[PDB]
Structure formats: C-alpha cells, structure tokens
Design a protein around this motif. Structure first.
Motif, mmCIF file in Angstrom:
data_model
loop_
_atom_site.group_PDB
_atom_site.id
_atom_site.type_symbol
_atom_site.label_atom_id
_atom_site.label_comp_id
_atom_site.label_asym_id
_atom_site.label_seq_id
_atom_site.Cartn_x
_atom_site.Cartn_y
_atom_site.Cartn_z
ATOM 1 N N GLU A 5 16.100 5.214 97.311
ATOM 2 C CA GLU A 5 15.804 5.503 98.704
ATOM 3 C C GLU A 5 14.508 6.309 98.815
ATOM 4 O O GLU A 5 13.504 5.810 99.321
ATOM 5 C CB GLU A 5 16.967 6.240 99.369
ATOM 6 C CG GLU A 5 17.050 5.902 100.860
ATOM 7 C CD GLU A 5 18.200 6.656 101.530
ATOM 8 O OE1 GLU A 5 19.310 6.622 100.956
ATOM 9 O OE2 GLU A 5 17.944 7.248 102.600
ATOM 10 N N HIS A 32 15.665 9.987 108.011
ATOM 11 C CA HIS A 32 16.857 9.172 107.857
ATOM 12 C C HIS A 32 16.487 7.840 107.200
ATOM 13 O O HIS A 32 16.925 7.549 106.088
ATOM 14 C CB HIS A 32 17.571 8.991 109.198
ATOM 15 C CG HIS A 32 19.076 9.057 109.106
ATOM 16 N ND1 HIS A 32 19.901 8.938 110.212
ATOM 17 C CD2 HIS A 32 19.898 9.228 108.031
ATOM 18 C CE1 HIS A 32 21.159 9.036 109.808
ATOM 19 N NE2 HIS A 32 21.155 9.216 108.456
ATOM 20 N N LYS A 34 17.162 4.309 107.496
ATOM 21 C CA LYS A 34 18.308 3.591 106.966
ATOM 22 C C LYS A 34 17.825 2.328 106.249
ATOM 23 O O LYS A 34 17.062 1.544 106.811
ATOM 24 C CB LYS A 34 19.327 3.317 108.073
ATOM 25 C CG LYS A 34 20.714 3.834 107.681
ATOM 26 C CD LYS A 34 21.189 3.191 106.376
ATOM 27 C CE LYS A 34 21.377 1.683 106.544
ATOM 28 N NZ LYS A 34 22.521 1.400 107.441
ATOM 29 N N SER A 36 18.441 -1.183 105.052
ATOM 30 C CA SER A 36 19.286 -2.330 105.337
ATOM 31 C C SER A 36 19.306 -3.276 104.134
ATOM 32 O O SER A 36 18.312 -3.941 103.847
ATOM 33 C CB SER A 36 18.809 -3.070 106.587
ATOM 34 O OG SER A 36 19.831 -3.161 107.577
#
Length: 96
Positions: A5, A32, A34, A36
């Motif tokens: 990440e 954050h 995100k 996918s």
C-alpha cells in the motif's frame, strides 16, 4: 502500517516529483487511498491543506490522471486493469 500500500502511495509520489504540471497535487497527501483489488482503482481521498486547495489538487489529479495511471502501467498494461481514481469524500457521502 504500510506494506505494498504505502509503496503505491510512494509510487504516485515519485511521479508528482518532476511531474504534474505546476506542482499542486504535491500538496494533496492522501490519508486513506483505498486500493481496489490491488492496482485497479485507487480512491485517493486527498487531504491537502484543508480542502481549501483541493480544487487545485483534485483539479490537478484530473490532468495528472495520465502520469498516475502510468505508474500502475509501469507494471501492468491494460485499460481495465490499472488506473487511479480521484476522491474527496465518497463523492458526497450523502444524497443531496
């Protein structure tokens, strides 16, 4: 935490460096983002100064959607496979 990440986060960063016409998104700084799937979509919430510059950041991410998408491209190579998506707050986080 970090893992791949953080790697992805640092990736887009590596780009902004020398990229992104007129340093702007460089101020963003997601908190954050995100992931996918893995590198398909990247919902970057973006968190610049205080959303007072977002208009500039987000607006930059629009045209910067090229370099960014290129990042994940460095790996894969397909439209429906990789790509970053600009986000502010779930689009709205409400109805209307």
């Amino acid at each position: 935490k970090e893992r791949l990440e953080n790697d992805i986060i640092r990736l887009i960063n590596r780009t902004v460096i020398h990229e992104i016409y007129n340093e702007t998104v460089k101020t963003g700084h997601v908190t954050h983002v995100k992931l996918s799937d893995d590198l398909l979509h990247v919902t970057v919430y973006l968190d610049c100064y205080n959303r007072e510059q977002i208009d500039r950041v987000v607006g930059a991410f629009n045209q910067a959607k090229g370099v960014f998408s290129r990042v994940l491209a460095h790996n894969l190579y397909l439209a429906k496979a990789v790509q970053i998506h600009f986000v502010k707050d779930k689009a709205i986080d409400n109805a209307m």
